[PDB]
Amino acid sequence: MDKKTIYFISTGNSARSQMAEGWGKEILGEGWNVYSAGIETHGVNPKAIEAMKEVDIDISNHTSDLIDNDILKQSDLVVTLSSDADNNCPILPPNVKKEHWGFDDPAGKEWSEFQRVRDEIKLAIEKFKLR
Ligand SMILES: [O-][Cl+3]([O-])([O-])[O-]
Ligand SMILES: [Cl-]
Ligand SMILES: [K+]
Numbered sequence: 582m583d584k585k586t587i588y589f590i591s592t593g594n595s596a597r598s599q600m601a602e603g604w605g606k607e608i609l610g611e612g613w614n615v616y617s618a619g620i621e622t623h624g625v626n627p628k629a630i631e632a633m634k635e636v637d638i639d640i641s642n643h644t645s646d647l648i649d650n651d652i653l654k655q656s657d658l659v660v661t662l663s664s665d666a667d668n669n670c671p672i673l674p675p676n677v678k679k680e681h682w683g684f685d686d687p688a689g690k691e692w693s694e695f696q697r698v699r700d701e702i703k704l705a706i707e708k709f710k711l712r
Contacts, residue, residue, distance in 0.1 A: 582612075584612055584613060584614055585612060585613050585614070585657040585658070586613065586614040586615075586616070586652070586655060586656045586657050586658075587605060587609065587613050587614075587615055587616075587656065587658045587659075587660060588616045588617070588618065588652060588653060588656040588658070588659045588660070589601040589602055589605065589615070589616070589617040589618075589660050590617070590618050590619065590620070590648060590659060590660070590661050590662065590666045590670055591617070591619050591620075591661070591662040591663050591666050592619060592620055592621060592662075592663045592665040592666055592686065593620070593621045593622065593623050593645070593688075594617055594618050594619030594621075594625075594645040594646055594647075595623050595626045595629065595645060595688070596626045596628070596629040596686070596687050596688060596698070597629075597662045597663065597684050597686065597687070597698060597702065598617040598618065598619055598662055599625055599626070599629050599630075599640055599643050599645075600629055600632060600633055600640070600698070600699050601617060601660070601702050601706065602615055602616065602640065602643060603633045603638045603639075603643070604638070604702055604703050604706045605706055607638055608706050608707060608710055609706065609709075609710060616649075616652050616656075617646070618646050618647060618648040618652075619645065619646070619647065619648075619666070620647075620648075620665055620669045620670075621647075622646060622647050623645065624645050625640070625643055625644075625645050626687075626688065626695075628687070628695045629687075629695060629699075632695040632696055632699045633699065635696070636699070636703075648670075648671065650671075653671065653673070653677070654674055654676075654677070656677050657676075657677070657678065658677070658678045658679070658680065659677055659678070659679045659680070660679075660680050660681070660682055661679070661680070661681045661682070662682060662683065662702075663684070663686065664681075667681045667683075682705050684698050684701055684702060685698055
């Protein structure tokens, strides 16, 4: 069937949203275009890159972006990863569905927290695929 589009939006496009994009392309790649953005943009967190590298997923080529309206309007599903993203997300046109999957912000925390959030996001995406 026609490939769908999922857009992960978080406070920034530095950690949670980048790991979601990484997992999304790996798990949902066959039937989904996967993108990510932040309400704010502050570079990709090197620890998020390393966290994904540890599970053989390369996100070193990702970029930190604000929301692209063109992609947004053509998205089938928008997933917010933080309450700030949930609240600051633009009013979505009727053709776009929206869900909130919250995760803790690993910024400034110890290494194991990046691993923890990485794997919680992995689980959420694996469950999503089973719908
Ligand atoms: O994607 Cl976040 O940078 O909000 O973690
Ligand atoms: Cl799929
Ligand atoms: K991005």
